[PDB]
């Protein structure tokens, strides 16, 4: 049966099933006020699928100059063509190689650059913005988005959306690496998975993905979306409540010291965006500091809602295209205020 919603993370995460249900706000706002993330499924069924393919981005924009990041060692690959990234998105035989002769796991940095998405891709802009869930919160002029209504005493988000494009992590060693390291944002955000590319050449890579989800602490209902419904999993997230951010900073200062980093007692390991919490570190956070988070698998067409102030990290299972929009809900406006 069609149903309005269900629960993940053993009841701790709301999952809305109909992205355009006009009554979603009633269920959403109860969870959102408590500082929780929310998942909305099915957004891919609302979009023009031909606008979100890697081959179309390579054909239309392939001659632009860009920088990449090597996800395994954070090395910057400077001033290459964006087709050099797109043409290896799914075909492993076409990826840029490290010295060891292995194909690299790459992230496309700051593309489209700054606030230029709308100018560069006006048809993609319209398709996304007209189909975002919880539109009173998420549209630029929504009634419950305070972004355009606040004075300079508040940090306001840039004009969006922002595209996040990166290959999937592959090996057992890659299990400890982030696509996006642990960080927090002073605005709210909605992050939509618009394409998942499952490769070929080294295709048969299905089983290290299951051990990553299992060891990542994914709940039993989330494991059923793979095995029972054959949906395409894109990325494993860990999200922590904003109230737990200082306890996470205490753990990371202790670990940085144990690893011989030489840091002042007040430095901010979350703002530095230098850490990925692997299975060892997530268990230490729980046991030693009493902090529990949310382990979320984002499938094709899932929209993840990330509360302002909430520390979060992302680990791509397969090659992903994500598009995100920032907003300022009244529930979380305290996180962007510049005083006390
Ligand atoms: Cl809060
Ligand atoms: Cl476009
Ligand atoms: Cl709404
Ligand atoms: Cl990062
Ligand atoms: Mn973020």
């Amino acid at each position: 049966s069609m149903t309005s919603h269900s629960w993940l993370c053993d009841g701790r995460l709301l999952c809305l099933h109909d992205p355009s249900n006009k009554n979603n706000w009633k269920i959403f706002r109860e969870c959102w006020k408590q500082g929780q993330p929310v998942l909305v499924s099915g957004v891919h069924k609302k979009l023009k699928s031909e606008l979100w393919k890697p081959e179309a981005f390579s054909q239309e924009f392939g001659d632009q100059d860009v920088d990449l990041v090597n996800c395994r060692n954070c090395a910057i690959i400077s001033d290459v063509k964006v087709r050099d990234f797109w043409d290896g998105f799914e075909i492993i035989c076409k990826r840029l190689r490290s010295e060891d002769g292995q194909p690299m796991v790459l992230k496309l940095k700051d593309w489209p650059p700054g606030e230029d998405f709308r100018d560069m891709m006006p048809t993609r802009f319209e398709d996304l913005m007209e189909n975002l869930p919880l539109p009173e919160y998420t549209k630029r002029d929504g009634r419950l988005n305070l972004a355009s209504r606040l004075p300079s005493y508040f940090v306001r988000p840039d004009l969006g959306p922002k595209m996040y494009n990166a290959y999937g992590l592959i090996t057992a060693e890659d299990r400890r690496v982030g696509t996006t390291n642990l960080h927090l944002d002073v605005s709210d955000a909605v992050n939509v998975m618009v394409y998942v590319g499952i490769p070929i050449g080294e295709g048969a890579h299905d089983e290290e993905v299951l051990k990553t989800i299992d060891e990542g602490d994914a709940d039993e209902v989330t494991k059923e979306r793979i095995h029972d419904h054959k949906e395409k999993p894109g990325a494993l997230w860990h999200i922590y409540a904003a109230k737990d951010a200082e306890k996470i900073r205490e753990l990371l200062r202790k670990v940085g010291e144990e690893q011989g980093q030489e840091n002042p007692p007040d430095h901010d390991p979350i703002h530095d965006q230098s850490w990925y919490l692997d299975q060892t570190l997530r268990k230490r956070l729980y046991e030693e500091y009493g902090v529990q988070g949310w382990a979320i698998v984002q499938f094709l067409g899932d929209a993840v809602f990330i509360p302002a102030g909430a520390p979060h990290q992302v680990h791509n299972l397969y090659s992903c295209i994500k598009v995100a929009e920032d907003f300022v809900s009244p529930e979380h406006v305290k996180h962007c205020f510049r005083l006390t």
Side-chain angles (χ1 to χ4, degrees), residues 1-21 23-47 49-58 60-98 100-142 144-155 157-333 335-340:
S1 303
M2 190 233 95
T3 52
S4 60
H5 66 276
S6 63
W7 307 90
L8 294 169
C9 303
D10 306 318
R12 290 184 300 111
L13 178 63
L14 174 63
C15 178
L16 290 163
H17 296 170
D18 177 2
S20 54
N21 200 288
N23 298 290
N24 280 343
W25 66 271
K26 301 181 183 175
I27 327 175
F28 177 88
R29 79 174 185 161
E30 169 84 8
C31 297
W32 193 240
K33 74 179 165 215
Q34 295 180 65
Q36 305 176 353
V38 176
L39 187 143
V40 183
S41 62
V43 181
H44 61 310
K45 299 173 179 167
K46 301 298 196 175
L47 298 175
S49 75
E50 70 275 6
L51 298 181
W52 303 101
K53 291 181 178 297
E55 303 92 338
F57 291 122
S58 185
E60 300 173 38
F61 310 109
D63 284 342
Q64 296 181 24
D65 308 308
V66 297
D67 298 346
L68 317 178
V69 189
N70 176 340
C71 300
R72 291 185 173 125
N73 67 10
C74 303
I76 295 171
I77 294 75
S78 295
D79 203 27
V80 296
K81 293 305 195 175
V82 79
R83 74 163 57 77
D84 298 354
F85 169 82
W86 289 115
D87 291 3
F89 193 76
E90 282 149 324
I91 308 177
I92 294 173
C93 58
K94 287 192 169 189
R95 297 175 177 189
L96 297 181
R97 292 184 179 265
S98 35
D100 65 2
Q102 291 300 101
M104 283 183 291
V105 178
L106 295 168
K107 177 163 60 166
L108 178 56
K109 181 184 288 197
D110 189 25
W111 190 84
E115 302 182 329
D116 300 349
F117 185 113
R118 185 179 188 167
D119 282 337
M120 188 182 293
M121 305 179 173
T123 305
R124 268 94 169 186
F125 176 92
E126 188 175 24
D127 198 46
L128 176 81
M129 295 307 210
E130 286 297 308
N131 292 286
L132 285 178
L134 286 302
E136 290 199 322
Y137 290 97
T138 64
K139 291 183 52 106
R140 286 183 165 185
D141 61 342
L144 299 179
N145 182 5
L146 307 187
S148 68
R149 295 196 188 89
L150 290 172
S152 296
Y153 292 93
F154 299 86
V155 176
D158 289 339
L159 296 173
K162 283 295 288 169
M163 216 181 167
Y164 297 97
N165 305 299
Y167 301 170
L169 283 153
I170 293 167
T171 66
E173 288 185 355
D174 293 335
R175 201 154 296 150
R176 305 179 62 268
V177 174
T179 301
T180 299
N181 281 344
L182 191 76
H183 72 290
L184 69 74
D185 298 298
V186 298
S187 307
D188 300 306
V190 53
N191 180 302
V192 185
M193 181 74 68
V194 300
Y195 186 93
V196 181
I198 287 166
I200 30 161
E202 269 129 70
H205 173 257
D206 193 314
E207 269 110 81
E208 36 268 268
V209 167
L210 300 181
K211 176 57 152 190
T212 299
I213 286 165
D214 178 36
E215 196 187 310
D217 308 320
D219 64 76
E220 289 298 323
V221 182
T222 292
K223 285 178 195 166
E224 292 192 304
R225 286 178 82 177
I226 315 215
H227 298 104
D228 290 352
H229 300 288
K230 336 296 188 167
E231 299 187 65
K232 292 174 162 152
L236 171 63
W237 294 65
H238 299 91
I239 306 182
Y240 300 90
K243 70 174 172 58
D244 290 322
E246 191 57 29
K247 295 303 174 194
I248 295 161
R249 292 187 193 94
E250 294 172 359
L251 168 71
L252 294 176
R253 291 181 199 116
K254 173 165 62 164
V255 180
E257 189 183 80
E258 285 160 1
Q259 294 182 356
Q261 289 179 18
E262 197 47 275
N263 287 133
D266 74 328
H267 111 291
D268 186 348
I270 295 177
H271 189 261
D272 288 357
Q273 198 153 167
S274 71
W275 293 88
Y276 183 78
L277 310 178
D278 71 349
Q279 188 173 49
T280 297
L281 287 181
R282 297 185 303 263
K283 181 112 187 299
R284 199 150 158 206
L285 181 56
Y286 183 99
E287 296 285 312
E288 289 173 27
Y289 294 84
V291 170
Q292 182 144 26
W294 294 261
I296 306 179
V297 180
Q298 188 185 24
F299 290 77
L300 174 65
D302 287 349
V304 177
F305 284 74
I306 305 103
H312 60 282
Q313 61 182 28
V314 188
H315 172 102
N316 285 5
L317 301 162
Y318 291 112
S319 296
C320 300
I321 308 187
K322 314 190 196 79
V323 187
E325 181 73 0
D326 287 347
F327 61 101
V328 184
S329 69
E331 295 81 346
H332 302 148
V333 71
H335 295 278
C336 66
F337 188 50
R338 294 184 183 274
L339 293 166
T340 111

